């Protein structure tokens, strides 16, 4: 599901999915970014398997993701053919942007 | 030398008392001294467990059931083997043996407990694994203004739920 | 064999639990030392066939570099296993005089069975040195390795003062923890100390918490 | 449908036959004597499991026979009120009424009610309910039905005061 | 195990031991009658019993109408009539063994075959 | 939030049912401790090195469960045997020279017989229990016992001291039957083995329902049950949350208490959000100790007089 390897063979993306995807095949910087977020995800997987011994998927949580991206699809009318105008750089920075921008506790000190 | 004379006299008695007579009395006291000198090799009359193994082998000989232990111990089944055996359950006799394994089977069964079996059907669908292996069960809880609850549980994974 | 072997095994496990207690209280022990094999301990500390000689394998220990980095005042600690079933007043008197002569401030004592209150009355003597007693059967099992108890961690008085001036509390509304708690005797803390506790929460995983010793 | 009615009848009948076979095996003293519980308790577990399997197999057959223009089937798979258990309960069989899991206790000496002969554990004897609602009842089944209902009413009327106290 | 009474005076006999002849002599505590004991058994506690399923039989059990009737025969007289009924002991672990009493042979027999 | 939590936890208590105590009185006893249990059940998992070894499981149950003499006593008779070194009973005569290969004793024989099956179900032989009854006095009781392999296991004992026999010997009989422990730990009763399963991470990296063997009981102790070998000391668990508090610590106590109340209210009519139940559990535990919400319990605190 999640392994992407921009210079290797088996888990390589199809460059029909991105216009700026053919030429970047083999770039070191993008590969380093993908590998470090991959390591982030696998350490998260280890953490979750620790904090639930059973392996239950369904859990109570705040705001849904599935339906909100579903209505995003059906409002901005995605097609089945056009490679997106996205960049890997934009995605991997914007997720960490939103990650810090979630703000529950206003404060300044180390403990907060 | 009280123990090393007393057990030697005990083996003198329990080998002369046999229907297998001792004309090879020198062979039989050689067997007795071999028995006692391997018998001390656990303890050397310095451990309290000496008398226990002696009581085991002694009353196994004087058991009758069986008397054939005397014949097999005089015609073989050497005495330094029969400290390290500890085969008291294993010998004298085999009908009592097969009795003991029937007893052990009965106890191992009876120590098992309650295993209510939760009859299943495919009528509903689980929440966790979404399988139709619903360990359903039916009962009434609330007041008179309604029928039963339609209690639910999945047996494929363990997921309990309820239907409205 | 009879219960000689399980007595040896229980002493081995108690020795284990004491070693990890001294480790996670912050004193420099090799972590490999706690998985010493049972047969190796049996060969190492039995006299001839089955008798462990509990007086001699008692040992000294020193604070870690990180322990000195956090706190400026821990002298060396010293442990003991008597062989007497109940504990004699003169025996523990010689023990506490040895502690004072060797200039230690933490008393770590293990009793086989009950101790007379005439020994217990002079236990809180010689301040600032502190004395503690454990049972082997109370320490046959390392309590932290039970999965239900969360992690525990100690604080500095500086960090406590920082916490109080940050959350604008005053020393009393913060939730308590009894001195006679098993984790309290495990950490050896006294009154006025603050314990941070991290447990595996089910809506955020890691979750801060705080207790004050009373 | 009448052929489905006689299928319900023979299903209950073969359940009674297997119950009679198990009772005969008990009465000739050779049984498993299942682990954990007592000999009588295993006998009770057996007969309860057999009769519940009879009841819901009958209910499954009745529901799958029932037509697509049946309005109360339309009601129940439409949702709001009633259930499969409701339809089966009203239409095919009731199942053994009971108080606290055990079936209807030996109130009088040696038997259940004074109206049968002595020392019986048959589904009539303890009073497994044979009939549905529609064909009627026998007075014994009427009495056992009143027993289970009255138990429900008394437990509700005590538990309401206790739950009010603990809530407050 | 029974409790003998002094034949001179119907009173509870007690065991008491001879001082030198080493025999139990049941001496009466009322009168001076004494009697030697047949066995060295004196007292018996019996912490486990399983008994009482059978008795209470009168010679006309079948005269009562309420007992059910069957067609298994008595295996002495071969008459097909019978009266059957369960155990007369009621513990929470008594068995579903049955007792069959007839009128012709007037005999009690069971249905166990272990 | 606490008021909303209170009303949320209060709503489904009206839809309750009434083996193992459940329902309203179990909920009331849990919420309103009552240093009293009515169900002393404790769960024990084995060492994971023993997965499905039934002989190991019965060895463990034999190690843990307390028994008495009355667990194995059936035949308990009394005798007058005049000769101290020759039996009047013709069956016990070889045992005289079995123990004979210290005279000034009463010529009164107490005699005990046990069951073979009820002896070795718990895996004890008679020699060590004859040793045990020998060593518990060694001064007053001259104690003789047979071999294991005899058809009827017998104990022969006498009172030794250098008229007035029957009532003394009867009381000593009653004492040895009522008091002498054999193995295990007392206040623990019959123990049974369920074939549970457990969701376990697969070695290839998935999950699998894998069987294992467990121990359940009808008695409560904590200070001794992790001591015995072959036991996981970590994953032990008991319903009796006060003992878990006392042995482990208050954080483990509030975790166990929340687990117990979640099981009881999730038996039917489930569910509620975790936060309400957690708030209740932690506000009831946040005083360094357990505190039932009674007229006396939480109210006798530094709390304002009008509430
Ligand atoms: Mg106030
Ligand atoms: Zn499921
Ligand atoms: Zn008289
Ligand atoms: Zn006949």
> Which helix H or strand E contains F95, and what residues bound it?
helix F93-98
| Whole-number CA gyration radius for chain C | 19
Q: Which two tokens stand for residue D152?
A: 């429900």
Resolution, given in Å to one decimal, reads 3.8
What are B153's two structure tokens? 């549980």
At CB < 8 Å, which residues of chain F contact B? 15-17, 54-55, 58, 61, 94, 98, 101, 116-117, 120-121, 127, 146-150, 191-195, 209, 216, 266, 268-270
Taking one residue from A and the other from F, the number of pairs with CB-CB distance under 8 angstroms is 8
Chains A and E share 3 or more Cβ pairs within 8 Å: no
Q: Does D159 touch chain F (CB under 8 A)?
A: yes
Structure tokens at F53: 């070894």
Coil, helix or strand at residue F220: coil
E106 labelled binding-site residue: no
CATH topology of domain F67-184: Gyrase A; domain 2 (3.30.1360)
Tally Cβ neighbours within 10 Å of residue C13: 20
SS3 F159: strand
> What's the CATH architecture for E46-114?
Single Sheet (2.20)
Q: How many CB pairs under 8 A join B and F?
A: 72
**Residues spanned by the domain of D113:** 1-138
Instruction: Search chain A and give the residue with CA nearest C200.
Output: A51
Contact status of A55 with chain F (Cβ, < 8 Å): yes
The answer to whether residue F256 neighbours chain C at the CB level (below 8 Å) is yes
C211 and C197 in contact (C-beta within 8 Å)? yes
| CATH entry, E1-45, from 1.10.1060.10, 3.40.50.720, 2.60.40.10, 2.20.25.10 | 2.20.25.10
d(CA D123, CA D50): 11
Burial of B11 (0-12, 13-18, 19+ CB in 10 A): buried
**Residue C176 near residue C194, CB atoms below 8 Å:** no
| Long-range Cβ pairs for the range C36-44 (8 Å, 24+) | C38/C8, C38/C9, C38/C12, C41/C12, C41/C15, C42/C8, C42/C12
The answer to whether B43 is annotated as binding is no
**Under DSSP, is residue C106 helix (H, G, I), strand (E, B) or coil?**
strand
For residues D30 and E96, give the distance between their C-alpha atoms in angstroms, rounded to a whole number: 10
Known binder of ligand: residue B86? no
Domain residue limits, chain C: 1-141, 142-214
Contact F286 C175 (CB under 8 A): yes
Nearest Cα residue to F125 out of F134, F116, F112: F116
What residue in B sits closest to A54 (Cα-Cα)? B157
Task: Dump strand ranges (E) for chain F.
Answer: 42-45, 73-80, 108-114, 141-145, 154-159, 197-201, 207-211, 214-215, 237-238
Do domains E1-45 and E46-114 share one topology? The answer is: yes
- Round to whole Å and give the CA distance between E53 and E70: 20
Neighbouring-strand partners of residue F197: F211
B122, closest residue in chain D (CA to CA): D60
Total residue length of chain C: 214
- CB contact under 8 Å between F207 and A49, yes or no, is no
- The encoded tokens of residue F167 equal 């009532």
Q: By three-state DSSP, how is residue F76 classified?
A: strand
Contact F196, F52 (CB under 8 A): no
Q: Find, among D122, D111, D125, the residue nearest to E86 by Cα.
A: D111
How far, in Å, is the centroid of ligand 2 from the Cα of A59? 15
Q: Residue D159 and residue F14: Cβ atoms within 8 Å?
A: yes
Q: What is the CA radius of gyration of chain E?
A: 23
Residues of D in contact with E88 (CB under 8 A): none
Q: Return d(Cα B144, Cα D114) in angstroms, integer.
A: 30
Are residues F98 and B142, on separate chains, in Cβ contact within 8 Å? no
Q: Which residues of F touch A54 (CB under 8 A)?
A: 199
Whether residues C182 and F256 touch (CB distance < 8 A) is answered with: no
Residue in E68, E93, E98 closest to D117 by CB? E68
Residue C191: CB partners within 8 Å, gap ≥ 6?
C179, C213, C214
Contact call for residues E1 and E41 (beta carbons, < 8 A): yes
* Token couple for F47: 């060492």
Distance from C-alpha of D129 to C-alpha of D95, rounded to nearest angstrom: 5
Peptide bond into C176 cis (omega under 30): no
C-alpha B126 – ligand 2 centre gap (Å): 4
How many Å apart are CA F216 and CA B113, to the nearest integer? 9
Class of domain C142-214: alpha beta
Whether residue F149 and residue B62 make contact (CB cut-off 8 A), yes or no, is no
Distances (CA, A) of E72 to C102, C108, C130, D129, E83: 95, 82, 87, 29, 9
CA distance to B66, F88, F89, F95, F144, per residue, from B63 (Å): 6, 20, 18, 11, 17
Cis peptide, bond prior to residue B93, ω within 30 of zero: yes
Strand blocks (E) in D29-162:
none
CA distance F224 to A35: 51
Q: Are strands C106-111 and F108-114 parallel, antiparallel or unpaired?
A: unpaired
Other residues' Cβ atoms within 10 Å of the Cβ of residue E95: 20
Euclidean distance between CA atoms F204 and F207, whole angstroms = 9
Query: CA neighbours within 13 Å on the CB side: how many for C172?
Result: 2
Distance from C-alpha of C206 to C-alpha of D87, rounded to nearest angstrom? 51
Angle between helices A88-101 and A28-51 (to 10 degrees): 40
- Ligand number nearest to the C-alpha of E105: 4
Residue with token string 């006798």: F300
Record the tokens describing residue F45, joined without a space.
Answer: 């998992």
Helix (H, G, I), strand (E, B) or coil at F113: strand
Of the listed ligands, the closest to the CA of F199 is 2
* Peptide bond before residue C63 is cis, with ω within 30 degrees of 0: no
Q: Tell me, rounded to whole angstroms, the distance of Cα F38 from its chain centroid.
A: 14
Solved using: cryo-EM
Tell whether E9 is in a known binding site.
yes
Can you read off the two tokens belonging to residue A75?
A: 């409002």
Can you tell me the distance from the alpha carbon of D89 to that of D129, in angstroms, rounded to the nearest whole number? 11
Gap between the Cα atoms of F272 and F261, Å rounded: 12
What residues form DSSP beta bridges with B161? B152
Say whether residue C144 is in contact with chain F using an 8 A CB cutoff.
Answer: no
| CATH code of domain C1-141 | 3.40.1340.10
Nearest to F192 among B6, B92, B113 (CB): B113
- Domain spans of chain E, in order of start: 1-45, 46-114
**Residue F214, φ and ψ in degrees, nearest 5:** -125, 170
Instruction: Give the N- to C-terminal CA distance of chain C in Å, as an integer.
Output: 47
Q: What CATH number is given to the structural domain containing D19?
A: 1.10.132.30
Main-chain dihedrals φ then ψ at residue E56, nearest 5 degrees: 85, 15
3-state secondary structure of F106: coil
Closest CA to C27 of C77, C79, C62, C74: C62
Q: Give the separation between CA A102 and CA A96, rounded to whole angstroms.
A: 10
SS3 A98: helix
């Amino acid at each position: 599901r999640y392994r992407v390897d921009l210079l290797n063979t088996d888990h390589t993306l199809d460059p029909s999915l991105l216009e700026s995807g053919s030429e970047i095949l083999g770039d070191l910087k993008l590969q380093v970014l993908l590998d470090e977020e991959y390591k982030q995800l696998v350490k998260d997987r280890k953490f979750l398997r620790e904090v639930f011994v059973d392996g239950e998927a369904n859990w109570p949580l705040p705001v849904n993701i599935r339906r909100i991206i579903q209505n995003a699809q059906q409002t901005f009318h995605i097609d089945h053919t056009k490679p997106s105008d996205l960049t890997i750089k934009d995605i991997v920075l914007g997720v960490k942007d939103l990650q810090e921008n979630l703000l529950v506790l206003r404060g300044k000190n180390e403990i907060i | 030398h009280k123990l090393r004379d007393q057990v030697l006299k005990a083996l003198y008695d329990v080998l002369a008392k046999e229907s297998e007579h001792p004309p090879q009395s020198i062979l039989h006291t050689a067997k007795a001294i071999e028995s006692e000198m391997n018998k001390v090799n656990n303890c050397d009359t310095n451990e309290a467990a000496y008398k226990a193994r002696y009581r085991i082998i002694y009353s196994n000989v004087i058991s009758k059931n069986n008397p054939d232990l005397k014949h097999k111990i005089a015609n073989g089944d050497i005495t330094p083997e029969f400290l390290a055996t500890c085969d008291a359950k294993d010998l004298a006799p085999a009908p009592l043996k097969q009795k003991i394994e029937e007893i052990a089977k009965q106890n191992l069964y009876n120590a098992q407990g309650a295993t209510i079996e939760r009859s299943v059907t495919d009528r509903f669908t689980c929440g966790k694994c979404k399988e139709k292996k619903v360990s359903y069960y039916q009962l009434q809880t609330r007041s008179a203004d309604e029928p039963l609850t339609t209690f639910c549980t999945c047996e494929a994974c363990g997921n309990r739920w309820k239907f409205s | 064999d009879q219960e000689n072997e399980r007595n040896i095994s229980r002493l081995w496990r108690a020795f284990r639990t004491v070693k990890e207690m001294v480790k996670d209280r912050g004193y420099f022990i090799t972590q490999e030392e706690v998985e010493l094999p049972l047969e190796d301990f049996k060969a190492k500390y039995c006299d001839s066939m089955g008798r462990p000689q509990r007086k001699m394998m008692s040992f000294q220990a020193n604070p870690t570099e990180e322990s000195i980095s956090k706190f400026p005042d821990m002298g060396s600690l010293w442990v003991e296993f008597c062989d007497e079933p109940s504990v004699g007043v003169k025996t523990m008197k010689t023990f506490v005089i040895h502690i004072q002569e060797k200039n230690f401030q933490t008393g770590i004592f293990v009793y086989q069975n009950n101790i007379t209150p005439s020994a217990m009355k002079l236990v809180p003597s010689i301040p600032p040195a502190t004395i503690e007693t454990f049972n082997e059967a109370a320490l046959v099992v390392n309590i932290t390795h039970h999965e239900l108890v969360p992690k525990h961690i100690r604080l500095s008085s500086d960090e406590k003062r920082e916490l109080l001036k940050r959350y604008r509390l005053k020393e009393s509304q913060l939730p308590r923890i009894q001195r006679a708690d098993p984790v309290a005797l495990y950490l050896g803390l006294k009154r006025g100390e603050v314990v941070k506790i991290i447990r595996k929460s089910e809506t955020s995983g890691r979750y801060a918490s705080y207790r004050i010793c009373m | 449908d009448g052929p489905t009615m006689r299928e319900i009848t023979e299903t209950i009948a073969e359940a009674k036959k297997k119950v009679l076979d198990v009772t005969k095996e008990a009465q000739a003293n050779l049984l498993t004597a299942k682990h954990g519980m007592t000999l009588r308790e295993s006998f009770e577990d057996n007969v309860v499991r057999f009769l519940n399997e009879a009841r819901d197999k009958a209910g499954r057959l009745a529901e799958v026979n029932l037509k697509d223009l049946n309005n109360v089937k339309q009601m129940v798979m439409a949702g709001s009120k009633g259930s499969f258990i409701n339809i089966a309960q009203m239409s095919a069989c009731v199942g053994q009424q009971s108080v606290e899991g055990k079936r209807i206790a030996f109130g009088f000496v040696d038997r259940t009610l004074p109206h049968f002969s002595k020392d019986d554990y048959s589904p009539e004897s303890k009073g497994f309910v044979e009939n549905s609602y529609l064909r009627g009842l026998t007075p014994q089944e009427f009495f056992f039905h009143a027993m289970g209902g009255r138990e429900g009413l008394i437990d509700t009327a005590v538990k309401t005061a206790e739950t009010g106290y603990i809530q407050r | 195990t029974t409790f003998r009474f002094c034949r001179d005076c119907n009173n509870m006999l007690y065991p008491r031991e001879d001082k030198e002849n080493n025999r139990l002599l049941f001496e009466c505590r009322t009168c001076s009658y004494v009697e030697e004991a047949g066995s060295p058994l004196v007292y018996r506690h019996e912490l486990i019993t399983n008994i009482g399923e059978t008795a209470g039989v009168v010679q006309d059990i079948g005269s009562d109408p309420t007992l059910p009737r069957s067609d298994r025969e008595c295996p002495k007289c071969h008459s097909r009539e019978n009266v059957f009924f369960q155990s007369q002991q009621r513990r929470k672990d008594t068995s579903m063994v049955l007792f069959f009493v007839c009128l012709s042979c007037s005999h009690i027999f069971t249905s166990d075959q272990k | 939030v606490g008021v909303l939590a209170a009303q949320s936890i209060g709503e489904p208590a009206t839809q309750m049912t009434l083996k193992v105590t459940s329902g309203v009185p179990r909920l009331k006893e849990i919420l309103n401790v009552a240093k009293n249990m009515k169900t002393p059940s404790l769960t024990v998992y084995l060492e994971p090195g023993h997965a499905a070894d039934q002989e190991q499981a019965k060895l463990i149950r034999s190690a843990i469960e307390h028994t008495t003499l009355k667990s194995v006593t059936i035949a308990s008779e009394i005798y007058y045997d005049p000769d101290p070194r020759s039996t009047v009973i013709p069956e016990d005569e070889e045992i005289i020279q079995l123990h004979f290969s210290f005279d000034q004793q009463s010529p009164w024989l107490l005699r005990l017989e046990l069951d073979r099956a009820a002896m070795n179900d718990k895996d004890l032989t008679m020699g060590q229990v004859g040793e045990r009854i020998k060593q518990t006095f060694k001064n007053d009781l001259f104690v003789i016992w047979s071999e294991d392999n005899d058809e009827k296991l017998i104990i022969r004992c006498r009172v030794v001291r250098p008229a007035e026999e029957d009532h003394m010997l009867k009381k000593i009989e009653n004492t040895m039957l009522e008091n002498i422990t054999l193995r295990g730990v007392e206040n623990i009763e019959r123990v049974v083995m369920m074939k549970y399963d457990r969701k376990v991470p697969s070695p290839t990296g998935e999950y699998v329902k894998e069987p294992e063997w467990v121990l359940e009981t009808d008695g409560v102790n904590l200070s001794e049950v992790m001591t015995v070998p072959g036991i996981d000391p970590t994953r032990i668990y008991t319903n009796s949350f006060i003992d878990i508090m006392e042995v482990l610590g208050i954080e483990a106590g509030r975790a166990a208490l929340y687990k117990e109340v979640y099981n009881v209210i999730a038996s039917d009519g489930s569910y509620v959000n975790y936060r309400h139940m957690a708030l209740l559990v932690d506000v009831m535990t946040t005083q360094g100790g357990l505190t039932s919400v009674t007229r006396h319990g939480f109210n006798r605190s530094n709390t304002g007089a009008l509430m």
